[PDB]
Symmetry: T
Amino acid sequence: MEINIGIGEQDRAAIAEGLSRLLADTYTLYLKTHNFHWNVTGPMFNTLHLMFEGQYTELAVAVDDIAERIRALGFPAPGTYAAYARLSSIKEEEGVPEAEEMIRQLVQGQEAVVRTARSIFPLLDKVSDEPTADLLTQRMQVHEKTAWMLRSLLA
Amino acid sequence: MEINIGIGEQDRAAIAEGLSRLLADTYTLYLKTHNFHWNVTGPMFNTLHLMFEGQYTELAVAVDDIAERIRALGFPAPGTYAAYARLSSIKEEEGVPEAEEMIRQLVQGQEAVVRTARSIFPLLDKVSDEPTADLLTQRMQVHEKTAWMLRSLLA
Amino acid sequence: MEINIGIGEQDRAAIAEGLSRLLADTYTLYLKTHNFHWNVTGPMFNTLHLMFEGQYTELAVAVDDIAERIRALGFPAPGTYAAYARLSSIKEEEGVPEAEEMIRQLVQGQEAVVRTARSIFPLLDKVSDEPTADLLTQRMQVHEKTAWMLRSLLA
Amino acid sequence: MEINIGIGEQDRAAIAEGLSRLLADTYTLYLKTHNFHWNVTGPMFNTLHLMFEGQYTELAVAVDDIAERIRALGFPAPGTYAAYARLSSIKEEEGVPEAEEMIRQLVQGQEAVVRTARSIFPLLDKVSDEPTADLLTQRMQVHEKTAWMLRSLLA
Amino acid sequence: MEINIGIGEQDRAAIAEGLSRLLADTYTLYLKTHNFHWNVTGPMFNTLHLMFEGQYTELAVAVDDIAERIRALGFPAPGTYAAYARLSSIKEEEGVPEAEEMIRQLVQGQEAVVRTARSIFPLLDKVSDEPTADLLTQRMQVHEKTAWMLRSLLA
Amino acid sequence: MEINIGIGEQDRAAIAEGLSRLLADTYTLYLKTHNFHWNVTGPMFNTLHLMFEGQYTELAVAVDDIAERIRALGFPAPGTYAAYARLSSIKEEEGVPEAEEMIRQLVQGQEAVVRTARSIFPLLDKVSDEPTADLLTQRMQVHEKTAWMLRSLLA
Amino acid sequence: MEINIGIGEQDRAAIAEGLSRLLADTYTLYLKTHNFHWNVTGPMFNTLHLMFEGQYTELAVAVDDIAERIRALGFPAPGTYAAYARLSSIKEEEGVPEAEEMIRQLVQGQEAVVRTARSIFPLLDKVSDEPTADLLTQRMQVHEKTAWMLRSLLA
Amino acid sequence: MEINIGIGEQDRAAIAEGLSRLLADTYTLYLKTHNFHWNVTGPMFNTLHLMFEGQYTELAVAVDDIAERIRALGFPAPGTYAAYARLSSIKEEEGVPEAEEMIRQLVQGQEAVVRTARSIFPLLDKVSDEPTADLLTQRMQVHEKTAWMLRSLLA
Amino acid sequence: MEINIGIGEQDRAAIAEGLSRLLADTYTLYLKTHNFHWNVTGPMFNTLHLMFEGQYTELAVAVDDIAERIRALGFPAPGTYAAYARLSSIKEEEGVPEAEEMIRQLVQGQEAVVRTARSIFPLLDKVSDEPTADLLTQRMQVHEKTAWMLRSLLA
Amino acid sequence: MEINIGIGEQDRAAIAEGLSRLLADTYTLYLKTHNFHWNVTGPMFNTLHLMFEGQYTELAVAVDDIAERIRALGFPAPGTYAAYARLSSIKEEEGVPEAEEMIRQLVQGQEAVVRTARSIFPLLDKVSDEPTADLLTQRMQVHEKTAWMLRSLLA
Amino acid sequence: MEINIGIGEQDRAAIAEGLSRLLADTYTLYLKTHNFHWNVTGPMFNTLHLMFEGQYTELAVAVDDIAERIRALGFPAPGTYAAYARLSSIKEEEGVPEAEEMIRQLVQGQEAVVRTARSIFPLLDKVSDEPTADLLTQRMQVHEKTAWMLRSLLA
Amino acid sequence: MEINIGIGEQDRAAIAEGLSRLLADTYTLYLKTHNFHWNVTGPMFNTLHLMFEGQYTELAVAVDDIAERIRALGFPAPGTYAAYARLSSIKEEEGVPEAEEMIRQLVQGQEAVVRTARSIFPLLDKVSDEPTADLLTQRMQVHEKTAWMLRSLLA
Ligand SMILES: [Fe+2]
Ligand SMILES: [Fe+2]
Ligand SMILES: [Fe+2]
Ligand SMILES: [Fe+2]
Ligand SMILES: [Fe+2]
Ligand SMILES: [Fe+2]
Ligand SMILES: [Fe+2]
Ligand SMILES: [Fe+2]
Ligand SMILES: [Fe+2]
Ligand SMILES: [Fe+2]
Ligand SMILES: [Fe+2]
Ligand SMILES: [Fe+2]
Ligand SMILES: [Fe+2]
Ligand SMILES: [Fe+2]
Ligand SMILES: [Fe+2]
Ligand SMILES: [Fe+2]
Ligand SMILES: [Fe+2]
Ligand SMILES: [Fe+2]
Ligand SMILES: [Fe+2]
Ligand SMILES: [Fe+2]
Ligand SMILES: [Fe+2]
Ligand SMILES: [Fe+2]
Ligand SMILES: [Fe+2]
Ligand SMILES: [Fe+2]
Ligand SMILES: [Fe+2]
Ligand SMILES: [Fe+2]
Ligand SMILES: [Fe+2]
Ligand SMILES: [Fe+2]
Ligand SMILES: [Fe+2]
Ligand SMILES: [Fe+2]
Ligand SMILES: [Fe+2]
Ligand SMILES: [Fe+2]
Ligand SMILES: [Fe+2]
Ligand SMILES: [Fe+2]
Ligand SMILES: [Fe+2]
Ligand SMILES: [Fe+2]
Ligand SMILES: [Fe+2]
Ligand SMILES: [Fe+2]
Ligand SMILES: [Fe+2]
Ligand SMILES: [Fe+2]
Ligand SMILES: [Fe+2]
Ligand SMILES: [Fe+2]
Ligand SMILES: [Fe+2]
Ligand SMILES: [Fe+2]
Ligand SMILES: [Fe+2]
Ligand SMILES: [Fe+2]
Ligand SMILES: [Fe+2]
């Protein structure tokens, strides 16, 4: 059945490509946060284990919402290790850093998602896709708040 | 008591006129979805009876939110068969279609409401009314997601 | 598949006709109550906004129950503005009356539904349809309690 | 202690006998529904596994209510395979039918309980046992609604 | 405002008089049950303290439903010691009986409410007051189930 | 089994006598508040119906707590119309006053219970019954708060 | 689709045969417990009514778990009176025993289910089926705990 | 740790200064609303006591959300009487007005917060701070809806 | 950090010593109650198993509240078998009494805690430690109520 | 309507003056706690952000309870920045202290509220106002518990 | 601090290595299931969207449980795309298969996890690690049940 | 009534002796954890107070489960200070250690319970008691997980 939501095929494709980068960043941050939840040690273990648990639980919902916006636009949502490694701007950590370095990496991760979201608004200006713009705004709000709570631990 | 929310009376009347069409479309789609919920038959009965129930339940809240935004702008909210029949662009179904035609009609219904919402943004861009713009964006998000789920059944 | 519930087809059709009138009245009262919920003003705004919310919330469930009893009897449930205007004995209000007149109209609405319910019982005795008779009885109970609560506001 | 509820011992015994048949039918349908819940296969597995779960869960409560009405009338409630096999009008299925045949058998099962309930009303009329009449009416309502939901899957 | 629910003023007044006796009996049983809840002793203390608690909790809701049916019929609901002592057929217990006598009096109390309820049906036959008839039937169901549970303790 | 809670039998008997009057006053107020809940009319029906429901719901718990304190002191708790009519200082209303007069009466009821509670404190001075003193204090707190909310309606 | 869970088809059939006897025993105990719940009398009625309710509620869930393990092994789950009478080792009670005898029979029933579970482990040691062994262990744990609670009543 | 969220330091400082004013105005309206909740009297006491409770409860959450957006921007959130008095544009009420004047003041307060929110948008346009824009929009929607509910009481 | 709560160090030390005896008694009663919960047998098993469960569950919270009041006064809370055995006035039961003797011992236990609480008030009066006096009062209320429920089982 | 709660007008005014100082201290501590919740940084951010949230959430309920006790005594509750700055003994912090200094200040704040409550008991002794004394006691309990938890963080 | 749980370090490392493969397989199945949840189309969309959501929700909890068992054994839990691609035996699907192929792949995935779990038991028989064996058994139970539900759709 | 669960009396006694030592160790660790919960201080207070609270809450359930397995085996569950001091291998802490030493002692306590559980398996290998083996396994799983969480704080 044809899709008639006021956005043309090539524009929906370009928006889906941007949201695919956002999905890949968000999913990579999800797994990194889950990883640090398991692997963090030292005197802040209790609070960081819990904090990273809240963060990855929220990111699991965000992954679903971003993916299903791609579906609403008429395209398949990427969902493999290869697709996400190709699209993600977040570099993974293959070892076990000190807790302060875990916090710093997760701050940079929040900012990377924000940076990807910001890269998409120019396209949305040209096209007028208010639902996707609101999604991006919600994600920016969450990552900017989380960035504050994480960097506050360092000071 | 004078209303002083930063929008003049005839500008508020114009936004309320557009929201009245959005309300009438939303309410007509609500009754149609409720109708199909009761009347659908065939092997997809259980899943469509449930899917349509979730949709009309969400629409009943949306009708209330759209109507109370009209009130916040200082105008009466329309609420009769005659008023909605006059304002609605949704085509009503007087008989009992087969399930796949019910699904098709509801997809077109979602897209019709999006179109009505999209028609109001030019006005908000002249007058500046960010709360209504957010309301319209939420309706477009819900209806575009619902159109994906519905049309996915026909693939 | 044949329907063997102990009521013949012609009697099931006659009961469904009566329930179609009850459904149309109930749905018309639902919309009128919802209308007054949005549009009432004056010193009793808070209490009537709330009271009318409770009533239309209940009536939305009642619509579903009546329509699904029609389905159980083997007939399509009506669900359009045209069908309900043809069948309803409640007169819609196209303006915005004063609060006391809103209350008075809703009292009369409760009593109109009771009247339609009473009209159906003679048919049910002849054919013994105990489930439909209990449904009618429940509606009369709800509308007669609601009539008391509304008319108490006038005194 | 004597039982003085406005119904003589012989009439209570006769009503208890009728309810024993209703209980046996309801319990046999309960087990058949539970059986089909485990054993159904094919593309409708997810919907029918869930639908039959809802139905057997409701029937388990109904068995308790019918049995406890027998106890309120002053007689023991039957509760063995031999007693239910002797009293039940529902034939059990010893194999694993196709899903559509499972649906058909459950429709007939609903109608068999309705038929048993109908057969008890004459006694209740001659004797004025309003609580039992209301129990029978509630069972007829549930089974007639369930029959509609089931046979709609076959259209 | 006029009351047009299909029952004449003289008949509504006679039904309200019957419900007043039922209200009085139910409230007197409520207090007696609450009394025994406090004052029962011996090895069955824990079970009877709890069982009587469940019973008086249910009766408090019943008194409200009975009183508000009187109000729906257009008459004030009685609510004083003097009014209830004049209308109640339940004899109060001024001392502290043994647990077994407490149980036996509560059985008789259930049966007294049933008896008062049965006395009202003839009036409802000539008049067609279905909601009141259903209320009476509900009370009869509850009191006959409670009578079975209480007298079972004595066996 | 002897009671050894640090209060001799004569003092326990005197405290119980005082609590017996507090119980009768609390229960009388409970029934009066319940009565006004049913019978109030006029433009304040909705808010007074609800307010009086909250009050009688709280009073029902208070009755149980006061009676059980009497039980803990070693004496039976009174629970009959004749006992409460004898022990109570609260005047019952046998008719249906106007709403403003219902409010006034309930204000005077709250203050009467406070007076009855106040009358018991001297017995506890002598004896050091700290649990009873806390129960009286809580009743005074509730009733003084309720008196403010009620009389605030009259200003 | 072919089943590849690491257990050959005839070995799965043998485990399913053992679980079918366990299912038949558990379901027979379920119906006996339900029967005694309705029919027990005497001074222990309240506590046994409740205790047996808790037991049959647990057993209803265990029946579903056992049946679905048979399904996971690739075989139909038996579910008729004839099948369960054939496969069960627990004998039903066709009359109404005294309460102490009901308790004794339920103790023996718990122990019968333990014995049936035990009888299956030799097969599992040969074949290796750790999920089934864990299910059997859970049923032994529940039935041994329940036997303690039941026989404690008789001491 | 550097803040890299796509908004330079001077722009973040300016937005935080604007939100500091929104925070002060929101907290001042919070305390005024809480004040009127305690201090309102007259026949609308119940409805206004409840209505103003809902409002100050929502405002307390809004205070936290606005302050934490300031934190996300990298600046301290003000939170003292001196700071809020200095930053607020709403004037406090030091006495106890009549209920209609309390309503009027709270309507004006809603509109004053809307004005403070409006004053911040010019700054976000230049900079593109989509999360803050959404926050201002949410506050405008809540205050404009609340203004409608309050001013409806005066009509 | 100095402690400045209006009570000098020596008086706080003396209050903490008294609360240490109350904590020891309460913890010893908690373990005894938990013991009898496991070990009681006979026809009251179900009721005493449940009643003792409610009691020990409440006592667990009380232990925490007493200990933390000691901490608030500035002293370590005792928490070992030797500390509690040294301070406790409750004598432990090393065997398995009959149920009636378990009930009697638990009555005496409630009274032992009350006795210990009464021994502390003189100190509190001389010093005005109102929070500790309220804690003692709440413990006395619970234990005197529990003593009533337990001894009522014996009568 | 006269206030007759057993405390004379001048004494109620004096008690209300003391509670006004308590309210002002509690509200000032509420805002200081809210402030530190937003502004704290360093490795203890997570634990202190959450601890201070729990504290200000509880203080918000306490401010309402203290204010409504003032109302129950017949006096208006103060509720402005100026009224609280005049009455409060807590000095506000206009900057952003180190986390350890925030904790120290919050300890001193709990003790300041305790000191204000203690200053009122002499008056209450002369007048006899048990509800107010119980409220002060509860505040002292909460603040002394909170002081222990806070000062424990320093050790 | 040394780990002394009764298993030597290289034996724990070997168990951790096996569980790392189980974790990688579970996580790969999790993402594949989430992918298919987003991307499935056709008439089974509604039921497969729901079924796959329930599955990936369960798998997300299982990932955490398996990772935290690795942590309990004293080893870091892997958690990157590169590690999971290296350790997994399940192949991802890079395209969008038809619904029946999605079902078949998820059946094969359940069976793949069972094989990986099964492959670890030989090590557990040499070393003895009953907690890990119970985790493996739980995963086998879940995946075998899920395989039945999935393959039933293809029958 | 004889116990027939497939284990001979002296074999059950031996299993119950082992579980009695596990119960004593679990209860000793419970009290030590509760003690440290009250008495810990320093910058980790908030996290350790909460962490130790979660642990002692879980242990309280474990104590009940272990004791009631002893009861299912037909033996009394020990429950006094003297019995637990005799049976326990965990030593109590009579003073107030620094937080890091509290953590270290609780790690050692978790490992002690694991050793006690492990010590019972040789017996169960001779006797066969799968329910007890599963209980031991669950305790080993919980204590090994808790040991990781605790020792992670010391890294
Ligand atoms: Fe965790
Ligand atoms: Fe989803
Ligand atoms: Fe938004
Ligand atoms: Fe204009
Ligand atoms: Fe439905
Ligand atoms: Fe609304
Ligand atoms: Fe939004
Ligand atoms: Fe939006
Ligand atoms: Fe609303
Ligand atoms: Fe429906
Ligand atoms: Fe009914
Ligand atoms: Fe009904
Ligand atoms: Fe299932
Ligand atoms: Fe039952
Ligand atoms: Fe029952
Ligand atoms: Fe009914
Ligand atoms: Fe009670
Ligand atoms: Fe009511
Ligand atoms: Fe009924
Ligand atoms: Fe009913
Ligand atoms: Fe009501
Ligand atoms: Fe009670
Ligand atoms: Fe108190
Ligand atoms: Fe208190
Ligand atoms: Fe084989
Ligand atoms: Fe199932
Ligand atoms: Fe297990
Ligand atoms: Fe096992
Ligand atoms: Fe309030
Ligand atoms: Fe916050
Ligand atoms: Fe928004
Ligand atoms: Fe605690
Ligand atoms: Fe926060
Ligand atoms: Fe309040
Ligand atoms: Fe208190
Ligand atoms: Fe090795
Ligand atoms: Fe979804
Ligand atoms: Fe975790
Ligand atoms: Fe296992
Ligand atoms: Fe397990
Ligand atoms: Fe397992
Ligand atoms: Fe042996
Ligand atoms: Fe605590
Ligand atoms: Fe237990
Ligand atoms: Fe238990
Ligand atoms: Fe296990
Ligand atoms: Fe195991």
